[PDB]
């Protein structure tokens, strides 16, 4: 496919969210929308609010519907309350449609929105089984699909930098590309590789092995999926079962031990810095997630680096060093491969299909010595029993 | 300064 009318429509990095642009309402009310795969409800402010510099003024849009219904929307972090109704819609760097779509307006939140961000909605991607208030709450992608005829898939290329940005950097660099309704060869090398989607709720999936440097954790594959494991461009890092983590981090801890680094900086409480330009790659290992394929005994994997899971954050501090947060973290309700992770790969969420593909992302930060990968096939047994239930 | 997302409870 090509699609370069959508090409580089996403700003924003793994920590804020990253967002497109569009607009709601009559006449048009522009807003920035973060890009959540992991949950399903389309919402923006619509009232004052510290952090953000705009919101959705239903007395000023002349096709707004109001559906005299309230909602509320709780996230692993962050959460909000506000009114149902209905809005034109449109996606100025996306296909060129308008969709009459469900909307709730936010009427009051709780360290849902962020500051600086630059977003003020969040478009819920994901199926309509864990839509609020319930599933006949149409989200937006079934009502785009429904109303036109773009073809029920969507691609994230998110872009991460590498080093940190600053507020101008962030609003003038291209954090990625969300095409919708199509897959752009220009976006990804090698080849794509699907893992079917098990359910339609959030965008689950089964991780059937996990490495650490091509070591096997060696843990019934039930643990990597404990409760579920999901796809989500709306989480920064990558979060893994606490049984998970923990073995991860033992053998990740193992294989850097020639440096040591505080206990704070493995529960993601503090940073690491490293002197401008030394930061040692080449001691932390790659990660590799096996997922199940398409094809029966079938299996591939992905894998990521240090330059995918040690997060750039900026040291106040005044100095020319390079710091990072560690961006794996626990989880009590499981797997959560986020933007850390969907920063290495061009991610297609092949609805129609129902399945998730993975492709090397040309945008991917790495070094002269190793790069992320997928790679495939392995003859993996039993997988479907790596699923909770 | 280090935010981070965490975005559904189901």
């Known amino acids: 496919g090509s699609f370069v009318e959508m090409v580089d429509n996403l700003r924003g990095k793994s920590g804020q969210g990253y967002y497109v642009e569009m607009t709601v309402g009559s006449p048009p009310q522009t807003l920035n929308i973060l890009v959540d795969t992991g949950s399903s409800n389309f919402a923006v402010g619509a009232a004052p609010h510290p952090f953000l510099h705009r919101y959705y003024q239903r007395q000023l849009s002349s096709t707004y519907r109001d559906l005299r219904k309230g909602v509320y929307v709780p996230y692993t972090q962050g959460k909000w309350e506000g009114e149902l109704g209905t809005d034109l819609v449109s996606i100025p760097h996306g296909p060129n449609v308008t969709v009459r779509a469900n909307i709730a307006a936010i009427t009051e939140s709780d360290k849902f929105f962020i500051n600086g961000s630059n977003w003020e909605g969040i478009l819920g991607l994901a199926y309509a089984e864990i839509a609020r208030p319930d599933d006949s709450l149409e989200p937006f992608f079934d009502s785009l699909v429904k109303q036109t005829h773009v073809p029920n898939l969507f691609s994230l290329q998110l872009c991460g930098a590498g080093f940190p940005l600053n507020q101008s950097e962030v609003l003038a660099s291209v954090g990625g590309s969300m095409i919708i309704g199509g897959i752009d060869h220009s976006l990804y090398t090698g080849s794509l590789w699907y893992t079917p989607i098990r359910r339609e709720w959030y965008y689950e999936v089964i991780i059937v092995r996990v490495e650490i440097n091509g070591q096997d954790l060696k843990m019934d594959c039930k643990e990597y999926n404990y409760d579920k494991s999901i796809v989500d461009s709306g989480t920064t890092n990558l979060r893994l079962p606490k049984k998970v983590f923990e073995a991860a981090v033992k053998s990740i801890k193992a294989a850097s031990s020639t440096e040591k680094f505080p206990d704070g900086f493995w529960l993601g409480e503090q940073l690491v810095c490293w002197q401008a330009g030394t930061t040692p790659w080449n001691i932390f290992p790659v990660i590799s997630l096996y997922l199940m394929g398409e094809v029966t005994n079938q299996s591939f994997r992905i894998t990521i680096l240090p330059q995918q899971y040690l997060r750039p954050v900026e040291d106040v501090a005044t100095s020319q060093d390079d710091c990072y947060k560690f961006a794996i973290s626990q989880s009590s309700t499981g797997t959560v491969m986020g933007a850390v992770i969907m920063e290495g790969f061009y991610v297609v969420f092949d609805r129609a299909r129902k399945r998730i593909g993975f492709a090397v992302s040309a945008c991917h930060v790495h070094d002269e010595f190793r790069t992320a990968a997928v790679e495939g096939p392995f003859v993996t047994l039993d997988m479907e029993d790596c699923g909770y239930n | ?10």
């Open chain 2, 1 to 10: 300064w280090w935010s981070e997302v965490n975005x559904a409870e189901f």
